[PDB]
Every structure is written in C-alpha cells, then in structure tokens.
Design a protein around this nucleic acid. Structure first.
Lengths: 137, 61, 49, 113, 177, 84
RNA sequence: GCUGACGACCAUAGCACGAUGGCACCACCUGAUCCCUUCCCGAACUCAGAAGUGAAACAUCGUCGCGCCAAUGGUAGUGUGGUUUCGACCAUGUGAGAGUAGGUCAUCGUCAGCU
RNA sequence: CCUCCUAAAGAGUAACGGAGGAGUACGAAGGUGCGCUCAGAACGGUCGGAAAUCGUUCAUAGAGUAUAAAGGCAAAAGCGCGCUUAACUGCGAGACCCACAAGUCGAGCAGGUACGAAAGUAGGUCUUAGUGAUCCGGUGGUUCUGUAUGGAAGGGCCAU
RNA sequence: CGAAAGCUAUUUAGGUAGCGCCUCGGACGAAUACCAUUGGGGGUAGAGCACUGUUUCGGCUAGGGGGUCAUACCGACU
C-alpha cells in the first residue's frame, strides 16, 4: 500500500486530469512495459493488487519496476453527513494516470512469461492497457 | 598598539644556569633581582632549563 | 505599556503623549521636543496622563 | 582590499547620482593621489588633477602636502570648466589625511561643497 | 625581537634555498599568533574567566579580548553572547618576542615533554598546539595562582602547503617529533 | 455519521484585499506624485525620477513618461520616469 | 601598444586551467615618530616612505572542461466560430517549456598617464 | 484584523473551502555618521565531545530580519559603535483605494533641531496585523462666547 | 424607453440604506465603442525539477541491520 511517508499538506484540491503522458511514456528501466491507453485515478490498492500478481508470475527470476506512485490524497465524506461542515477526511491515495504512462516494467524473464504476467496485471487495473517493447528512440 | 591598557612590558634577562646561556627578551615578569648584562643592568630571572639544556636479559643467566 | 504625558518645561502647557514600559524604565523620561508655543526645542518632562 | 574599498564606496556613489550633481571622485594609492570630476550622468570626465602632472610629478608625491596641491589644482581646473557645486566622493577611503587634505584645498580654492 | 632581526638576516635566505624557492617574496613567514583560552565553565561562576584574562595579560603581554558565544547551545548551558573565552592576537615585534619566549623558555618547562607532532598542521601551513598547564610560562607565578589552566597557541604563517609550514617552523628551532 | 471520521477543522478566515500591483504601465504620461506600483518589498525598484515610500510604493517625482527596464548587475526590475 | 579612474551593459561578460607583465601605473612591500587606528592586534583603517618582488593579487592573452546563451522543426497550451462519445476534433489566428544543431573566454564611452 | 492558496498571469472575487497568525513590542529595537558580513562543511588545536572558544580554506545567503506568512533585503532592510531625539510643529502638489464613514503613499515649502567634513539623510521601526465611530464625562491649553452690565458658571476651539 | 436578483453595511439574512443597473430633463461634444499598428507589467494554461517537498531504480560509501575465541584497545567479514 504505497503512500508518501510525510506530506506538506493533508488535503488537496480535486484538480483536472487532462492531456497526454509526454513524460513517463517510454520503457525506461525494464526491457518490457505495460502502458495505459486511457486516463483515470490509479488507487494504491490497485498498485498492490497488480504488483502482487506480477511477483507471483516472475518467481524471483525477474525485476519489477513500478512507474506509478500514489501521492494524491482523496477525501471521502461518510454516510449520513450533510454537505459542508468542512472537507472530508482522507481515505486513500491515487496516482493520476494519463494515456501513455507505463504502470509496470519487467526485465530478466522470457518474453512469454512477461506478457503473461502483464496480462494478469491489467485484469486488476481500471485502465485499457497495452503491451510495449523498449526501443532505442 | 594602544596606550595605558596593556601591562608593563619591560626587558628581562633569562639565564639558564645549567648551560650558562643567556636570553635577552622583553616580557612582563617582575624579577626579584637585576644583574648586569653587556648593555646595562636588566631584571634577572634565573632559569633552570631552556632550549639549550632540554633534550633478552636472560643471556646473563 | 502605560500611557504617559511628556510636558514641556517652558510652562506653555504644550505636551506630547506616548507609552512606556514602567519595568524597564521606572524613572521619569526627559527629551528635547519641539514646542510650537515658543517655536523652540526645549526639555519635555514626563507627567501623569 | 580594493574589493572591500569599493564595497563601502557604493552607498555614496549611488546617492550622488540620485542627487543628479557633479561629483568630485578621489583615488589615492601609496604612490599617487588622483582627483577627477564626473558628470551627473557618470560617464564623462570633465576635469582632473593627479600627481602625474609635470608640475608635481618629479617631486614628493604620496604625501599630505602633495594631496593639498592636487586639491588646489583641480579647483582651478574645475573653476575654468563651469563647475562650482560638486558633491565630494571619498570613494571608500576614510575622510582623513591625504583624502581630507585634498578636500580642504579643493573646498577652499573655489569649489564649494 | 631578536627573531625579527634574525629572520630577515639569515632565516629568510636559508629557507629559500632549502625549499628551492625561485622568488624571495615566495618564502613563508609567520603572520599572526593567536592565543585562545576558551573557558566553558564561565557564565556559571564568573570567577574563572577574570582569572584567565589575568593569566593571558602576563603571558602574551597584551590586553586580551573576551570572546562571546556566537550561538546558543542548551547542552553546554550557553546562551547568546555570554563570555566563554578570551583571546589575544600578536603581530609584528610582539609575536617574535613571544615566539622566542615560547621556543626557549616556555616549551622546555612543559612537564613530560617529547616534542610536538608535525602532523598537527591544518594543511595550509598553519600550526596549532595546546598547552595543558599555563604555569609553564615564567610570567605567571606558582605562588599566587588561582588554578591550573590550559591555553591554545595558534601560529598563522604565510605558507600555502604543509611542507613549507614545517620548514618555516624548523628554522626557529621548533620542537617537532 | 458512520465511520465517524469527519469533524471540525476551523480554518475559515482570511484577510482583506490590499489592491497591490502596477497602477501606471509603461509608456504612459504621468504627473509628479502619481503612484506607479504598490507592492510588498521591492519587486520593482525606483529608477531615475521615481521615489519610494515607506510602504515600498513607487511614485513619480516629476512629470514625464513612465518606463520599465531590467537594469543593474542584479537583474532587478526598475521603473523610471523619463522626461518625455 | 599598455596601465589607471569612472561609467554603459549585467555570464555569448561568469567559473576553471595555463601562460605573460614590472620602464610608467598598480599591487604586494618597509617602518609606526606623526595624524588616525584595534571591544586585543599597524590584520583592516591611517600616516611617513622606496630596500625588495611580480610570489600572491590584479590586468591581459589562450581554451569548450563546466556554466551561460541558443535556433529550425515538431509537440503542449490557447482567442474566435463549429462539432463532440467530454477524451478531444475541425477551420482560422497564435504558439511554448523541455530537448537537439549550434554559439560563447564579451562589447562599447569619457578622461589621465607611460609608448 | 493580517499572510498564503482557492483567484481563471492587471484589480476584485464566494463556500460551516484548505492552511497559519494578530488584539503586541521598542527611548532603542527610532535618526544619523562610520564600520562589518552570514548558515554550514572540512582540517589543526588543553580540558572539549557531534556541536562552546581559536586559527585556516570553500561558502549570493542554503543565515538573519522582535513577532505568522508572503513579497523583499549587498547601497544590505541583516550586524556593531559614537553622537543624538525628525517617534518634530504648520502643512502638503499629486495620487492609490473607496457606497459612505474611513484607510494608504507622498515630493515640496516654512520654522526649530539631530547626525555628517559635506552633498545630504531624518515627519518612527523592511513592508503588509497589533484595532473601535458617535454620545457622554475627565484633564492640559486658549480669548472665542458669556441671557441687564462687569465678572463668573456653563459652552466653543486645539490637545489628550 | 426599459432593469435587477450584485457590492458594501445592517439585532442583517424574504427588511432597508449608499453605490452598480433603468427612466426623464439639462450641460458637454467625440473626450466613447469596434479594428489595425504599437508601448507595458504579469506568473495562469502548458511545462519542468533550479528551490520546498514527495517518489522509484542503480552505483557508491562514514551511521545502522548479523556471526568464533574475544571489556583483548569492542576485531576479522557480510
């Protein structure tokens, strides 16, 4: 369950996830990545569900990179609470994802077992992902 | 060097009795006696040691 | 800081008014302030306000 | 150090040009003492007097007496330039000795500041 | 100041050839000598420090200056600008008489003396030693003494390297090793 | 209020506006006494013909045309009143 | 030709490294009587000076190692009109930042001095 | 009431929106003249260390600025010293801001000074919070009035 | 001809008052608007880590995590 160790401020403005991932859109660490074709919020429970699934497939034979860290707290108002009276408490941490961003990379593993592990990770993710090979340019 | 804020700084004759070597240097120490040097009589401060006087068994069976 | 009256010593009755700490300045304060009644700088002596 | 000397000259230098007046800038060294008058703009020299002048080059320069001669000499040159009201610039040097002696000679011999 | 006359007479020359300098103005020389007697026990008894100031006056021959704390330290019970040490800077003829006194009269009077390590140079040709008992100097007397105290002696030279610094100090007969 | 995680966080106060900023922009005619910049600190510095108040306010010392330039060794923003 | 003063400009001007300069000028430099200095110190300031030296500093020259500057093209954004699945797209007008090719060891003004 | 964001690159702009401060302090912590430069790191050094004091080399502020934050600050607005009272009086061209009532900045002029050798600088403090109208009552001044007249009481004006 | 449902203040919040907006009359007359060219300051969109934080991987190590005799100076090596 990724989360920043300490933050400057407890709460954040909603914001507006728009645009393309012109940064963090190329396979930089691994030899094999899984990037996103759609945008959205990638919560920290989806980080650890897709990360646990890839670890069980590589079986201490590869290296996994997580190019996505949740550092944006999402407040939520509990049930039976009127509007106003402040801003709700923080309940979870998302990472803003844009079309193009890789979420995970692999290295050191048969290209068939790497595709088979990134396929299993996309199943736990809220994104339409795709499979991308690391290139020169 | 300001005036009348510093201690008395007068000539004193340091004499190492061991090697009988003298040392003319100005200082503050108030010597009890005053001997006569080549120039005149300076406050004599006797000195004991100076730079000129400071520096198996089983075979006997 | 209590309020005090700085009263000229020229007997013209003109005065200034200021504050003072009566723990770091327990004695009366005196200063050369301008007196418009005689258009002259004279000593002003602290008085109760 | 010249860097420190010019660091403590900048306050007066910048206040002189705000006043928009001609300034009498002085520069002394262990051998010579210089005195030149700069325009309110600050990029034109209109009158100078140094110990490199032939009248008092071959003499005892680097002296309080030589500083008086330079101050006396620039006041004449400034007088025959249209300049009568300058603002003295000690250029970081303490207003004392050679710099002071130059200033009194200039201040007494026609320049008024 | 026999060392002032003796340095400009033959020490300045012999150092140049011994170190192979090409410029006489490049030879090292001693610039200042600073005596530090930092007393951390002050501001709590106010008797130690005046006795230190009295000690330095006799030793150095100049009125010392009382150095105040630059920063507040709760561990040492030290607040802003409390007097926690005295210091004196010696220059010109005043340093050379002191250095002569320290070389010939003061250092031999150090109990259990073996020589000063030459690795106590800071790397820029500057030497610093430490005297544990201030009674070594004949200026201070054993009879009417307050208490045994120490003092720092820092020698500032015009050298740029450790090798030049130790060569300069060896010229005066400094007790190395 | 199930999960009971809400609660008062009292930070609902603010200060009044100060109406700072550039009052007369470059190339404009100006008369002496006219305020040019109201600011905190010297975001802009007083050049020739411009005075500086205790508030750091920059005002025209004389009539002319206000001009902005970045001058000096500190690359500071200066405001000047050119006699034009 | 070089040196100094004061400016313009404020890194394409800076940093770093190396080399050159002592006839003038500058700088270290000598000394501390004197003016004047130090919460101690002739260090700095100040004075009186010319034995030494260009060692440092300074100035000048050289270079691309750093820094700085910097296109063309493309991309992002965006005013207006339209469309949209609300992500964006079309027309028109604008148009970055980053990065790349590349450039850079500045450039001038007044005055004085040695040549 | 002040500072930041929300606030959409002029101003302004709401929420029981997100974060913090104020209801003071200082006769020096104001003025002026002069002088100075920090935080750190490493090396050397008696007690003495991770860090007291000292010396050396890097060191555009990684410090400080009485007080939160923002914006500033080398000509330092930061840090010392000497002398001081401009923390003046009468004002104020012209502006900012503004429903009003208020609030803010201000060159320049006259008088009296303070510092400086002088040109000069000084109408409080780096700035922005540290505040409360009118009525009424008190106090220091004042020739303005003074119910027949002279006073006085009371009232007015200026200061508090 | 032709609004407003705003700002400020209010024992005010569905009332009211000044300003903003409407109308009528008077004064003034281009001082106004649109567009072209042009002088300005900005810190938003975007962007980016140079500051404040936050974040992942690698290299690299004073501090830390462990194991014989060993207060033997706390030593060899992970």
């Amino acid at each position: 369950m990724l989360q920043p160790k300490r933050t400057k401020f407890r709460k954040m403005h909603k914001g507006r996830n728009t645009g393309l991932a012109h940064r963090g859109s190329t396979v930089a660490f691994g030899q094999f990545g899984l990037k996103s074709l759609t945008r959205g919020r990638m919560t920290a429970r989806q980080i650890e569900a897709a990360r646990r699934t890839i670890t069980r497939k590589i079986k201490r034979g590869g290296k996994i990179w997580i190019r996505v860290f949740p550092d944006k707290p999402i407040s939520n108002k509990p049930l039976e609470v009127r509007m106003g009276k402040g801003k709700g408490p923080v309940e979870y941490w998302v990472c803003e994802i844009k079309p193009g961003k890789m979420l995970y990379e692999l290295e050191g593993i048969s290209e068939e077992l790497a595709r088979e592990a990134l396929t299993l990770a996309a199943a736990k993710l809220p994104f339409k992902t795709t499979i991308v090979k690391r290139t020169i340019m | 060097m300001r005036k009348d804020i510093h201690p008395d700084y007068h000539d004193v004759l340091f004499h190492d009795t061991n090697a009988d070597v003298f040392f003319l240097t100005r200082s503050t120490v108030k010597t009890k006696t005053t001997r006569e040097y080549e120039g005149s009589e300076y406050p004599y401060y006797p000195l004991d040691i100076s730079s000129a006087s400071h520096p198996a068994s089983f075979n006997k069976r | 800081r209590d309020k005090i009256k700085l009263v000229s010593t020229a007997g013209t009755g003109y005065y200034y008014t200021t504050t003072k700490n009566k723990r770091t300045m327990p004695g009366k304060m005196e200063m050369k302030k301008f007196d418009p009644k005689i258009r002259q700088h004279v000593l002003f002596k602290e008085a109760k306000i | 150090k010249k860097a420190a000397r010019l660091r403590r000259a900048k306050k007066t230098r910048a206040h002189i040009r705000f006043l928009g007046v001609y300034r009498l800038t002085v520069n002394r060294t262990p051998k010579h003492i210089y005195a030149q008058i700069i325009s309110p703009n600050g990029g034109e020299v209109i009158a100078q007097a140094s110990t490199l002048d032939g009248s008092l080059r071959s003499g005892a320069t680097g002296n309080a007496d030589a500083a008086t001669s330079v101050g006396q000499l620039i006041a004449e040159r400034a007088k025959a330039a249209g300049i009568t009201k300058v603002a003295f610039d000690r250029s970081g040097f303490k207003y004392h000795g050679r710099v002071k002696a130059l200033a009194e000679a200039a201040r007494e011999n026609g320049l008024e500041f | 100041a026999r060392l002032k006359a003796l340095y400009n007479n033959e020490l300045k020359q012999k150092i140049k050839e011994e170190l192979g300098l090409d410029n006489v103005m490049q030879v090292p020389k001693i610039t200042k000598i600073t005596l530090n007697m930092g007393v951390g026990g002050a501001s709590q008894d106010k008797k130690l420090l005046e006795g230190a100031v009295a000690d330095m006056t006799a030793i150095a021959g100049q009125k010392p200056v009382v150095t105040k704390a630059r920063k507040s330290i709760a561990g040492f019970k030290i607040r802003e600008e409390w007097p926690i040490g005295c210091k004196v800077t010696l220059r010109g003829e005043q340093m050379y008489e002191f250095l002569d006194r320290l070389i010939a009269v003061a250092i031999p009077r150090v109990r259990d003396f073996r020589g000063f390590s030459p690795k106590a140079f800071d790397g820029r040709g500057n030497y610093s030693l430490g005297i544990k008992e201030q009674i070594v100097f004949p200026e201070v007397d054993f009879d009417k003494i307050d208490r045994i105290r120490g003092m720092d002696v820092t020698i500032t030279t015009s050298a740029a390297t450790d090798d030049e610094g130790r060569a300069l100090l060896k010229a005066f007969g400094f007790p190395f090793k | 209020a199930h999960k009971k995680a809400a609660g008062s966080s009292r930070n609902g106060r603010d200060s009044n506006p100060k109406m700072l900023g550039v009052k007369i922009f470059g190339g404009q005619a100006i008369v002496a006494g006219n305020i040019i910049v109201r600011q905190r600190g010297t975001e802009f510095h007083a050049g020739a013909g411009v005075g500086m108040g205790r508030d750091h306010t920059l005002f025209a010392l004389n009539d002319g045309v206000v001009k902005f330039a970045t001058k000096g060794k500190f690359n500071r923003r200066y405001v000047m009143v050119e006699e034009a």
